[PDB]
Every structure is written in C-alpha cells, then in structure tokens.
Amino acid sequence: IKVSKAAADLMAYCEAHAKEDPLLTPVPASENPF
Amino acid sequence: DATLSQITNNIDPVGRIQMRTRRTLRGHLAKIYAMHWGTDSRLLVSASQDGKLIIWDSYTTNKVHAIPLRSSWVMTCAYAPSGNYVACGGLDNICSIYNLKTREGNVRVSRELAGHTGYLSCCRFLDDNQIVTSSGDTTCALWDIETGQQTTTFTGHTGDVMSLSLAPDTRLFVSGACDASAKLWDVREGMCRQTFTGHESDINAICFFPNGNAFATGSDDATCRLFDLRADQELMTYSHDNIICGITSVSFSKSGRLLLAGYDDFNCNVWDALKADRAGVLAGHDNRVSCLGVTDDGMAVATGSWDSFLKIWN
Amino acid sequence: LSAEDKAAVERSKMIDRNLREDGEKAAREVKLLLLGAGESGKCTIVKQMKTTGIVETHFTFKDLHFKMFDVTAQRSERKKWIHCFEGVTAIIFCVALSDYDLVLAEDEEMNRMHASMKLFDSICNNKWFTDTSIILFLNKKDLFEEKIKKSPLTICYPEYAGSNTYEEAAAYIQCQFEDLNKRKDTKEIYTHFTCSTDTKNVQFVFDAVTDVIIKNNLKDCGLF
Amino acid sequence: AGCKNFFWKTFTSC
Amino acid sequence: DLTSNAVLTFIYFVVCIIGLCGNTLVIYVILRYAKMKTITNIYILNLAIADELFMLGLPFLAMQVALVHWPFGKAICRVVMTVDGINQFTSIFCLTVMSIDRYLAVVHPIKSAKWRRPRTAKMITMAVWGVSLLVILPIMIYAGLRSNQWGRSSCTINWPGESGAWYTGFIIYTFILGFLVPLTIICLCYLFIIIKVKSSGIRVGSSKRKKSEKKVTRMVSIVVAVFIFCWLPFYIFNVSSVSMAISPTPALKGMFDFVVVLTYANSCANPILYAFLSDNFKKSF
C-alpha cells in the first residue's frame, strides 16, 4: 500500500467528517450544555 | 515517496482555537492520573492518590459517585461504554472493577483482576464482559468480568508497556511500550500483525484515529509520530523547539483534526495533525497535566493535572 | 432553584463532606516509603510495626498512625512509578552494613554496596523527592561487627584508609551515605544503627517523623 | 469633659 | 509649624500607598496563585483584609493631622473610628491566633492534626471578628465632636460624667487585652516553639538544628522587635498623657503622630513579612 494513498485517505476522511465542535465551533453558547 | 506534510498545502491552516475553562471541577485532594469519557459524553471518572474513585457529570458540576479504593496508589481508570462497570488499575496489580447501577445505594466491588505481575499502566473497556488491561510486565491481557480469569495474553513488547487505545470496531488496537515501538494486536487472532519502530524515546501516550487506519504515538522526547496500519510507515511528525519535556497524554478530536497532546510544561497543546503546527495552547493548570480525554461526539475536552483540579474545555 | 434535582445536589454535598473528612484523616496519619537493594534486611521493620506489587503495613504508635509501603516486589523500572509517591511524610532506605564484600548476582562485577549507593544516588537526584527526607536504617549491625573483625574494608572502598574497627567504619560509611545527595538544604538524611531492640527502633521512627512533620509546618508557616 | 491632650489617636485642643 | 504637619502628611501618605500596593499584592497571590485550603493561607488572607481596611481609614486620620479642622462630619467620623478600631483589634487578635496556631503545630504536632482545621479556622476567624466587635463598644457609644474657641473642631471619644475615671479606666482596658495579653501569649507561644525545636533537634541527632533554630530565633526576634517598637512607645505615651496633665507642645504632637505611623507601618509590614519571607508563598509568587 502506497504511503500517498494512505495520506490521501486520511485527508479525505478529515475533510468529509468535519462536523465537530473544537475545529469550527458552529453551535452557540446555548446549545452546548457547558 | 510522498509525505503528508507536503500535500496538505492545499487546505488552509486552522487558526487559534479559543478554548476556555467552561466548568471548573474541584473537590479532589490528590494528583489525578487518568480518566475516561463515556459514550453519553456526560459522565467522567477520575482517579487520585487519595484512594477515591470519583465519577461525576461535567454538565451540572456536582459529584455522583465516590468509591473508596483499597489501594490508594491508583494510576489509571476506565469507563465502560454502557456505563454499568468502572475499572481502576492501582499499584497493587489489582484491576478493581466496580458496578455502578446496583440494587443498593452503596457501590459493591464487582470483580478484582490480580493476575498481572507488573504495575497496571492503563486499561480499556471492550464491552460489559471483556476488558483489556495493560500492565508493566511487558505484556497485555484480555480479561473477562464474568469469568474472572485471564483469557488472552499478548507477549510481543520488549519493554514496559505504558499506553493502550482501542478502535471503534473493537477489532484492531495498537499499544505502545517503553522500547520506542508501537505494535498492533487483535482481540480474536491473538498475535502481532504490524509493528512500528519510528520513535526513539519512552512512549507514554497513544490514541487511535476515528478512521480506523491510522493512529498517533507520543514519546518522552517532546515529539509525536502519526503512523498508519495500511502502509506501515511514519506519515508525519510533530516537534517544536519550545516543547522539551515528555508527553504523557495524547488524544484526538471527534474526527481526528485537532491532535490533543499533554506535556509536562504545565499546559496543553493542540496540533493541526495535517501540517505539523501547534494550533492552540491551553494553560491554567498549576502542575503538569496527566490525563487528557476528548468525548466521543467531540463536545468538550477534559484535562486533569497533578493539582487536584479538573478543567473542561470547549 | 434546582427543584427537580435537589436530591442529587444534596447527595453531592454529603459525599463531598465525606471526601473532606477522608482527606483530613489522610493528613492526620503518616505515610512512609521504604526501599532496598533487593536483599537489604527490610524484614526487621515488620517486627517493629504493631499491625501483589506493593504491600501496606499500618500501625499506631504513640497516638500516631504510620503506614509503611514496600515496593521491592515491583520488577518494572522505577523511573515510571517513582513519581506516584509524592507528598509522603518520610522515606526509608534499608541497607545492610555487612553487604559490602558479596557480589550482586547481576554481572559478577557489581558490589552490593555499589548498587546500594547507585540506587540511593538515583532516588536522591530526582525532581520528585526534592522536599521529602530520607530516614535510612543500617541493618545487621552485629553481623557487620563479626564480618569487619576479619576484613580490611579496602575491597569495597579503595580510597578508604583507617583502623579496622566498628566505631570508625560505621561513622565513615554514615558520612558517605549522607554526603551522597546534592539537596543538602531541603532534604535531611537520618542515619540510625539498628540493634536487636524493637522498642528503640519504633521510638526513633516516631522521633524522626515528629522532626519531619515539625519542619514541614515551619516551611508552610514560613519560620524555616 | 476633661479635654485630654492625647487620648487614643486624636489631637484635641482646649 | 507648617513644615512639621507637611512632613507628617507626607509620611502618612507614603505609608498608605505602600500599604495599598503591599496588601493588594498579598491578596492577589493568595486568591489567584496560592490556594485557600491551607490553614495559614486564610490566616494571612484575613490579616491582609484587616490590613487593607486599616489602610483605607488612614487617609481620614491623615487629613485630621494635616489641618486641625475636621470638616467631614459626625456620622462619617463615627464609622471611620469604628473601622480603625475594628481593624486594630482584628490585626492584634489575628497575630495572637496565628502564634497559637504555630504553637500548637510545633509543640504538639500530633494533637494539632485534629485540633485545627479549615472549618475550625473559619470558626476561629469568626470568633476573632466577634470579640473585636465586643471590645469596641465604648468606642461606638461614646464618639462625638469637640469644638474649640478658635472655630476648630476635633472628633474624639467623649466620656460623660466626672473626668479622670473613664479615661484611665479605658486606657488600661485596651492596654491589657490589646497590648499586655496579646504580647505575653505571642511571647510564650514563640518561646515554646524554640524549646520544641531545640528538643526535637537534640533527640533526632541529625546535627542540623543549628541553621534551623537560628532562622526561627531570628524570625521571632524581628517579629517581637517590630511589635515592641511600634506598640510600646505609643501605649506608654497614652497612659502618661491620661495619668498626668501635659502641656501642649508641637514636639509632642510630632512624636505622637510619629508612633502612629509606626503602628500603621507594623500593620503594613506584618502581611508582607509573613508572605515575602515565607517559603511556600515565595514559590507560588
């Protein structure tokens, strides 16, 4: 398995799954329980 | 022939991550060593040298359960995905598992795993029956709560094993030892599949990528290395001239973008995990951090240091 | 004002009071950590106590609760768990004086006293035990006298030169173990010659811990 | 009365 | 006599600003850097708060010694005399309970583990503020104004009835429980500590009690010295003034105002002495 293929796979998975709080934080101060 | 750091120039680098102390957690009187997040992302368990396993919720900031441990010199603790059992590995080589949801109000000792010969570094939960425990005798063991005896043994590490992490499918799991080597093992096959000898110091922390084909390792020479299970080669490394101390806590985000890393310089760092740059720095702790755990849904990040103070970051 | 979860909050304050009481009781007692070079003769301290990687022996003497912890059974490297004993009241370093001519069973070239001094040098030059004090006990006093009566003592220490007696060799090896650490101001080394007496050993322990807990209070208040 | 010169902290003239 | 009140207002101001910045620094390290769980930590914190309020009432006394006229009022003088009174007795009582806490911790290191506690220290400080309000009863119920023939007005404690009875009765009331009793308790507590350290040193045989006892003896010496130098001359001046009538003299006014700044300087140096010269406080700061 090529290392460039695994690198492209990691980049594709990181760009497809981006609905997280620490990265962009799109939720307001009322949605999060903290 | 192509590295990951040289192909990430298309995507822009993430800016400074603004994470403040949302809910401070006090009450402990001893240094915290390890923690674990549940599947509900609400309850968390912490262990300190005072011999008290305290489980509570980070939302309302109030204690729920406090189990008095037999051995006060506890070094690790884990939380089951279902939330019924909780295990802690002390210096007495006893992986004491306690049942939370019981008939009576008091907590009763469910089982004790005293088959290991070395100190328990860390443990992880597979399900309500099976449990993997990492000890200090250069081996790992898969125990059964219902049986109570050691079922599977993995002897492939030439040094003291300090770290362990599981995958979402609970099929593959990597482990790091003091011999600067990370090895992959199976829960059903029972032998080492792949190995990585890219590190050159004492590996103290580890974490599994949510994708399932990669993972990161943190050694004591102030650097992290991102390995993969497909190509068997170091993808990239993270090392700065500022960090000089060891790394005792490595975690990932909900997807694996913000590589969490806990150092001994009284603060925590956040790497981009793609371009090898410290995106954010989290300070506020008096002593060096010991545990660093991110929720499954990536809601918040909990940090526990040796100052008996738990801090939640969002 | 949190009426739907008032019982949960009340239970939280109740167990928090028990945590403060347990932490207060933990500060009232005394925790002692003893070390050795594998075979040093630490069993003599078990008989002085009134009463599995590590063991814990608790005993109350002169209205003071002591807790001795043995970590000799830990076959792993000490550098990965020596920081787990921070904040202890006292540290003990058991060592037999007569174990100076025997060779350790590691490479047939390492003396027992050399390995004991190396372990003492490692546990002293560490960032974890900078504030704690070491109360070392010299075991096998009578056996050391019978062994030094027919030994020149020049095999262990080549630079040593003196009369072949006990009153001078014991004082010489005492100063050698005292000037081995670098933190001569924060750490304090207490040398004690153990004899065939149990009430005398437990009395020196109580007097040594009393001096330690006093010097700790002077550092917190600011007198010392 | 009395008109003390210095009693506690004050200067009271007569 | 203009340059006399000018330099007096000067030394009254510099001791006030060094008290504001000095006490606020101690409070900043205690609340932010240090922890509030240590028994001696909240003791210095309570002493710093008592020293802060004592320095806040100092400009009122500094304005009274600058010009003879008191244009503030009556009710404002009643509250500032209570504040100056409640802070003086609190700081004195704080030094007493601190010496007792040090005495119990050194002489009886076994019984002190169960005697003093964070909850117990809070009850001790609550009792300190309680007894301090009890000893200032005549100061609150006998405060008033005094008018002069030249139009000047001076606010002081007035005692109804015949003179020479309530004045000498109150001057010995504050001398016993404010100077005599607190000093003897601090002296006896510090003396027992020296004996306890000397006894523990000769019993352990560690041959290291030389530098340890010398530092504690020097610390006790400088504490008692600054306590005597700023409280003994001020007290004997009050007793000698109320016992025998003394003629008004500008040198006596300057001397009376000088020992007051020394008393304020002692309350200014006491929190910084327990903080700067301490080991745990210097490590946190």
Task: Measure the CA–CA gap between B65 and B63, rounded to whole angstroms.
Answer: 6
Q: Which subunits sit against B, judged by 3+ Cβ pairs under 8 A?
A: A, C
The one-character DSSP state at C152 is -
Helix (H) or strand (E) segment spanning residue B195: strand B195-196
Based on the number of CB atoms within 10 Å of its own CB, is E123 exposed (0-12), middle (13-18) or buried (19 or more)?
exposed
Q: What is the resolution of this structure in A?
A: 3.1
Task: Measure the CA–CA gap between E23 and E273, rounded to whole angstroms.
Answer: 11
CB contact under 8 A, E242 and D7: yes
Helix (H) or strand (E) segment spanning residue E199: helix E181-204
Name the experimental technique. Answer: cryo-EM
Largest CA distance in chain A: 46
HEC-encoded secondary structure of B12-62:
CCCCCCCCCEEEEECCCCCCEEEEEECCCCCEEEEEECCCEEEEEECCCCE
Instruction: Tell me the CA end-to-end span of chain E in Å, nearest whole number.
Output: 45
The one-character DSSP state at E176 is I
Among E106, E201, E281, select the one facing C222 at the smallest CB separation: E281
Location of structure tokens 């009450």? B27
CB contact under 8 A, C75 and B68: no
Chain C contact for B59, CB < 8 A? no
- Specify the 3-state DSSP secondary structure of E166: helix
Q: Could you tell me if C64 and C209 are in contact, meaning their C-beta atoms sit under 8 angstroms apart? A: yes
In chain E, helix, strand, coil percent, each to 5?
80, 5, 20
Q: Could you tell me if B103 and B147 are in contact, meaning their C-beta atoms sit under 8 angstroms apart? A: no
Residue-number span of the structural domain to which B114 is assigned: 1-313
Phi then psi for residue B290, to 5 deg, are -120, -45
**Distances from the Cα of C219 to the Cα of B145, C216, D7, E106, E207, angstroms:** 48, 5, 42, 11, 19
Among B27, B68, B121, select the one facing C16 at the smallest CB separation: B27
CATH number at residue A26: 4.10.260.10
Separate counts of helices (H) and strands (E) for chain E: 12, 2
Q: Which of E86, E92, E97 is nearest to E56 (CA)?
A: E86
Q: Could you tell me if B21 and B301 are in contact, meaning their C-beta atoms sit under 8 angstroms apart? A: no
Q: Please enumerate, as own/partner, the contacts of E203-206 that have beta carbons within 8 Å and a separation of 24 or more.
A: E203/C207, E203/C211, E204/C190, E204/C207, E204/C208, E204/C211, E206/C188, E206/C189, E206/C190, E206/C211
**Sequence-distant (≥ 6) Cβ neighbours of residue C96 within 8 angstroms:** C39, C40, C41, C138, C139, C140, C143, C144
Q: Please enumerate, as own/partner, the contacts of E127-135 that have beta carbons within 8 Å and a separation of 24 or more.
A: E128/E46, E128/E90, E128/E93, E128/E94, E128/E97, E129/E86, E129/E90, E131/E89, E131/E93, E132/E86, E132/E89, E132/E90, E132/E93, E133/E86, E135/E89, E135/E173, E135/E174, E135/E177, E135/E178
CB contact under 8 A, A13 and B211: yes
Name the minimum distance, in Å, from the CA of E200 to any CA of chain C.
6
- The residue type of E184 is T
The one-character DSSP state at E177 is I
Task: Measure the CA–CA gap between B210 and B219, rounded to whole angstroms.
Answer: 21
Q: Could you tell me if B223 and B240 are in contact, meaning their C-beta atoms sit under 8 angstroms apart? A: no
Q: Which subunits sit against C, judged by 3+ Cβ pairs under 8 A?
A: B, E
Q: For residue C173, how many C-alpha atoms fall within 13 Å in the half-sphere facing its CB?
A: 28
Q: Could you tell me if B214 and B197 are in contact, meaning their C-beta atoms sit under 8 angstroms apart? A: no
Task: Measure the CA–CA gap between E71 and B41, rounded to whole angstroms.
Answer: 65
Total structural domains within chain A: 1
What sign has the CA pseudo-torsion C193, C194, C198, C201?
positive
**Sequence-distant (≥ 6) Cβ neighbours of residue E230 within 8 angstroms:** E259, E262, E263, E265, E266
- Specify the 3-state DSSP secondary structure of C24: helix
Chain E contact for C150, CB < 8 A? no
Among B14, B23, B59, select the one facing A23 at the smallest CB separation: B14
Task: Measure the CA–CA gap between E243 and B301, rounded to whole angstroms.
Answer: 72
- Specify the 3-state DSSP secondary structure of C175: helix
Task: Measure the CA–CA gap between E191 and E187, rounded to whole angstroms.
Answer: 6
Q: Could you tell me if C116 and C95 are in contact, meaning their C-beta atoms sit under 8 angstroms apart? A: yes
CB contact under 8 A, C214 and E106: yes
Phi-psi region of A13 (alpha: psi -120 to 50; beta: other; left: phi over 0): alpha
Helix (H) or strand (E) segment spanning residue E154: strand E153-157
Total structural domains within chain B: 1
Alpha carbon B30 to chain centroid, angstroms: 20
Helices (H), chain C: 6-28, 44-48, 112-124, 141-148, 166-178, 198-221
Domain parsing of chain E, residue ranges = 1-285
Q: Which residue of E has its CA nearest to C213?
A: E109
CA angle, B227 then B228 then B232, to 5°? 90
Rg (CA), chain B: 18
Q: Could you tell me if B260 and B281 are in contact, meaning their C-beta atoms sit under 8 angstroms apart? A: no
The one-character DSSP state at C150 is T
HEC-encoded secondary structure of B284-300:
CCCCCEEEEEECCCCCC
Task: Measure the CA–CA gap between E59 and E57, rounded to whole angstroms.
Answer: 6
Q: Could you tell me if B60 and C30 are in contact, meaning their C-beta atoms sit under 8 angstroms apart? A: no
CATH number at residue B95: 2.130.10.10
Name the minimum distance, in Å, from the CA of E223 to any CA of chain C.
11
**What would the two tokens of residue C107 be?**
């490479």
